[PDB]
Amino acid sequence: DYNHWLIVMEFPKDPAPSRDQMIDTYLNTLATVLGSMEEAKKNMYAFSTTTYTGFQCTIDEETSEKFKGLPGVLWVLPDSYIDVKNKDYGGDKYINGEIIP
């Protein structure tokens, strides 16, 4: 069973929202599913606004369905790479509220 999900989102191409605004959308999208913005910030562990626009998070399969239909949500994929050495989606890391360089 898949416990970790890649949520791919879409943003208006013009004018394009800023990196910060995209990340805020991710967190608000997770917060909607999880219950709270604080849960979201402690859950999400990776994301992108460049190589792709989406984020990675941990929910059970049934809950991952709640992402479909939410504004901006495009595609809900299982995270194959969270635990594979030397493979990733080309994303950035996010740890408990802080973007990692």
- Residue numbers of the site for Ca ion (CB under 5 A)? 42, 46, 81, 84, 87-89, 91, 96
Which partner, its own copies, Ca ion, none, binds residue 98 by CB below 5 to 8 Å per kind? none
Question: Cβ 48 to its own copies, closest distance in Å?
Answer: 10
Burial class (CB in 10 A: 0-12, 13-18, 19+), 59: buried
Which partner, its own copies, Ca ion, none, binds residue 42 by CB below 5 to 8 Å per kind? Ca ion
Strand order through the sheet with 73-78: 73-78, 4-9, 54-58, 46-48, 92-95, 98-99
Question: Cβ 87 to Ca ion, closest distance in Å?
Answer: 5
Instruction: Give the CB-nearest residue to Ca ion.
Output: 91
Enter the tokens of residue 60: 């059970």
Nearer to its own copies, 31 or 81 (CB): 81
Beta bridge partners of 99: 94
Question: Cβ 84 to its own copies, closest distance in Å?
Answer: 8
Nearer to Ca ion, 24 or 38 (CB): 38
Nearest Cα residue to 94 out of 52, 45, 53: 45
